[model samples]
Target: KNPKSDKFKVKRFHHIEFWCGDATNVARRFSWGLGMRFSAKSDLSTGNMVHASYLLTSGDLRFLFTAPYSPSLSAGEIKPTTTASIPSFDHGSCRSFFSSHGLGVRAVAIEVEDAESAFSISVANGAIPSSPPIVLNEAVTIAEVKLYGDVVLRYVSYKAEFLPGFERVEDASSFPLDYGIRRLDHAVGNVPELGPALTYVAGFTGFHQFAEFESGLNSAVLASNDEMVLLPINEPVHGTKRKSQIQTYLEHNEGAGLQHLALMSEDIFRTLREMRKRSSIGGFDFMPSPPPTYYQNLKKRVGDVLSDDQIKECEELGILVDRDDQGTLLQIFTKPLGDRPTIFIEIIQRVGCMMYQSGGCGGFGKGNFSELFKSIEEYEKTLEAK
Candidate 1:
C-alpha cells in the first residue's frame, strides 16, 4: 500500500477553539459577523473558566473562536505591565487563542500512520516542539509542534485493529459529516515593516513571493511547495489617506504576527450565499461590507474570464476578486475578531491556482502610501492617549 495512502490519512480538520474573557458577547458577535451557527455550548459550571465556542464552516473549512472567563487577577495586580494588562478584548482573544487553540490564527492537524515520522519532518523544518509524541490509551499517539512564530502543526497516529468510539467515525450528526477541512488553504501574516527584515524572515521559512499589488494594492506570498500558508507583509506608509487600523496594528503588535486564516472552498458563490443567510439569522454582524466599485472595475483591470453574471454575483455578495495567468480566485475578509483588530478570517475559492506564492503580485508597501502615513499618525495618537 502507498505509505501516504495507508498512513497520514487526514479525515478532516475537526475544529479550532479560542479562549476569551467575555465569551457570551464574543460568541454572539462571531456568530453574526461570520454567519456561523451555534453547534454546541458547554456549561461552565464544571469549575473551569467559562467558554463559548462558535462554529463557522464553508465546505471543508471549520472555524471556532472561543471566549473564556477573565482571570481573577486584574491588570493593576500584576507586576511588570504587559500587553495582557490592556483592557482590550483583542489581548484576551490573543491570549486565549494561543493558550487554548494552538498558535497563530491558522493550525493544521494531520492523522498519520506514523506520528514519529511526521514529527521528525516538522522538527527538521524549523518547527518548535511543544510536546514529545505521547501514546494515548495504547491505540493512538500524538506529536505536536508550534511552527514559524505561532502556527500550530500536529500529527496523530492510530495503532489499533479496531476503531475507537470517536477515533475514526465517518460522521457525527452534531457536526456535519461531509464538513471536512480538507487541505491547508492559505494563511496571512501581518508585519510592522515591509523592508529587509520581513523579506529575510520569508526566505528563512522557504516561502516565496506569489502575488503583489502596486498603487494601493496588496501583496501575498506562499511556501515554495504550494502548501496551505500565505504571508501578507505590510509596512507603515507615512502620509494621509491610510486606514488607521492597519497602522495601529503595526505599532502595537511590535512585529509580524498572524493576521487572518483564508479557508479554501470549491463553490465560491454558494459558500458566500450560505454564510450571508447564516449571519442574518445569528444577529451578530461585524462582517466587512465589500465596496461596490471593487466589482465594477474588477474585470476591466483583471480580465473578462469570469462571466458577467459571476462578476455581478460577487459584487452583490461582497466578495473580492483577483486573477492572473494562473487563474482566478474569489476571496472575502472578515473584520477584526476582537476590539484590537488582531485576528480574522478569509474565505477563498481558487479556480486554477495551485500555490500560495503571489509571484511578486502581492507586496506590502505597493498601494496607498498616504494610507500608511495616516496609520502612523493614528498610532501616535494612541500612544499619546495612553
Candidate 2:
C-alpha cells in the first residue's frame, strides 16, 4: 500500500548513529574494514566533554559512532527537560542507552523539512516524542521520536561538518581508497511481530510499502515518498524446523533492533575483493559461498543478465547474484560486525537498472535469500557445535 501523503518532507537519510562502548575502535573498524574516511569527530579535544564521537563517510554513507564518558565525570545537572526528554550528548543518558543495546544503532537520522512540525505531527499520530525541536550549531534543527527497541528516529534538518561540536579531520588514517561503497541501500530491522511494528512505523513516518516477501522470515519493505530511505522490517517465521535468524537476533540483541545495513556499491567485485583482503586484519568476514551447483545453475536461471566473467568473479568472491524485471543484484553479507551476531553489513551492487539510481532498482534479492539463510544456518550450527 502507498502512503497517500507525507507528514513532513523527508529529504534523505542524513546519517546513522551508533552508540558504542569504544567509539574509536568501532570507528577504526569501519575505516580500516569498509574503507570509510574518518572525516569528523567530537571529544574532549574538541571541547565536547560528555562523550567522544567519530564520523565516517563513504560517498553518501555517513555513520556516527559515539561512546559516553564516565557517568560521574559528566555534568551533574544534565537532567531531561520537559521539552527535550532525551538530552543530546549527556553522558549519563548515553551510558544507559549504550547498555541497553550494546554497540548498536541509536538513531537513523532523516533529513527532513520543518523538524518541529515533524516531531509534533508524529507525536499527534500516537508517537511518543523523545525530543522536541532543538537547534544545534546555529545551522541544524533536530527532533526525535522513539522507534522500535531503544533506537530513535531522528528528524534532522541540516549538517555541515556533521553537526555543531564535530570538527573536521583530514584523512586521519591510511585506509584503502577504492572500495566503491557508495550509499545506504536499505536498513533491515528484526522485530518480534511485523504487523504492529509496521503499523507504528508507517503511522508515524508515512512511508509506503515498497515490496514484501518471505524467505527465512516474513519481511515488508517501506520507502519514503522520495524513495531515498528504505526500511525493511522483518519478523521471524513461526513453526520452522530450525530457529529463525530474526529470533536469534532478538535473543542476542536483547530486543528488536537493526539487523543489517545494506551499503550500495558501484562495483561489487572490486569492493568485495578489497574487503575480503582485510579479513585477515580487521575487515568483515562474509558468509561462505553457496554450493558449487548453485553457481553452476546461475547461467540457466539469470541467462545473459550477467557476463561470464562477472559470474566467475561472483563465484570467486563468494557473492550471491539474483535478478528481477529491472536488473541484476549482487550482494554478500558480513558475519556480524561485532562480537554478538546482532548487527552486520551487506555490500550490494545493482546492475543496469534504467542506467543507475539508488535504493531497490534491482529488488531485495529475495531469490538469493534461501542460499543466504542456508549459509547462516550452517554457520550457526557450527557455533552450536562449539
Candidate 3:
C-alpha cells in the first residue's frame, strides 16, 4: 500500500513561512521564549521592501516570518494586481492573503529531488499550480501549488544557496542564543476530503501510507519515500464520534487548513523544563498542564513499559505517554498561539522498540490523544461555550 511516487522524491523542508501583521512580534515569541535562534532579516532598509521578514532556525528546523509593510499592502486597501490568476510575492498579494487567513502559515517549501517534476506531479494529483517553477538566478529553484486554503506548498531544489532575493543577516548574533526543538517530527493537516487528500499526496508525491489505526477518528500518516517528511493527514468522522477535532478546525479556520504541528524532541523533559522558564518571560503559554486523570490512565495503558520513576517524572512535569507498536512514545500539547483556536503545537519523543510492532494505530504519537482528548474535548467545549 506504499504509494511512493518514484518520480518526485521529497527529502526535507527548506523553510516554513508564516504570514502575519507583525513578523517581528511573532519572531520574538519564538526567539525570546521558544529558544529558536534568529538567523536573518530582510526589510525596506535592507532593500527587500516587499515585506518585512525574519528567519529563525533551531537545529534543522527553519522558519520564516513575514509581514507586508509596503503602502500597497496590509488590509486597509492598496493597489490591486493586474492578474488575480497569477500568484505573486509582492506585498500586495500578501496583504490580501493575510487579511482573510489572519496570522498563520502561508507557504511550506519542501526540498525535493526535482523541483519541476514535483510541481507537475502535484498538478496531476488535483493541486492547482499557483506559480510555475522559477530559478532565482544563481540562488535557488522553486514552484508553488495552491492547497485547500490560502496556504501554498512549494518544492525547492536542495542544491540552492537559499531563497532568492533574501540576503544574509549581517549581525545574526544580535538575538539571545537558544535552540529548543530539533528537526520537525511531523506536521498534521486538516482537510474536508480526507481520502482524496491522502490519496493525492501519496499518488503525486513519494509518500507512502505507513500506518492507520485511528480508532474513532479518520487519519492516515504519509511518509515520504526519502524518509525525510511525515504528514499525519486527518479529517473528522462525520457521525457517531462524540468529538471531531478536525471538524472543529475546519469551522474555526473558515476552511481546510493546518491544525497543529508535532515537533520531535530527544529530551522532551528538558524542552518542557525550558518552556516553563519561557512562559514567564515572553508571556508564552504552553497550554495548561495535563490533569491527574490523564497521567493515571497513562499508567494503566503503559503497564510496565515505563518505570515507576519515568511515569512519576512525566507526571511531575505534565507529560503524557502511550505505548506504540515499536515501543513507548512521550507527548505533550501546547495552548493555541493565535487569536483563533486555529494553530497549536505538540511535542513528542518516540522510544520505538525496533522488532516489536503492531498493525493498527501504532501510537504514532501513541495513545495519549484518546486520554489527552478528554481534557482537550473539555477545553474545546469551553471554546464552544463561548
* Maximum-TM-score candidate: 2
- Candidate numbers sorted by TM-score from highest down: 2, 3, 1
Give the lDDT of residue 116 in candidate 1. Answer: 70
Error of 3 at 327 (Å): 3.1
In candidate 3, how many Å is residue 362 off? 6.0
What TM-score, computed on C-alpha atoms, does each candidate reach? 0.59, 0.90, 0.83
Report the lDDT of model 2 for residue 29: 84
Error of 3 at 235 (Å): 1.7
lDDT of 3 by residue, 247-313 (tens): 7777888777777667767578888888777777773577666766666666777867777777888
Query: How much lDDT does each candidate structure score?
Result: 0.48, 0.79, 0.69
TM-score of 2: 0.90
Q: How far does residue 245 in candidate 2 sit from its true spot (Å)? A: 1.1
lDDT comparison, 1 vs 2, better candidate? 2
Q: Per-residue lDDT tens digits of candidate 1, residues 129-223?
A: 75567655577766666633444445567775211212121234233422222333655555545565345544334445554432322334544
Better of 1 and 3 by lDDT: 3
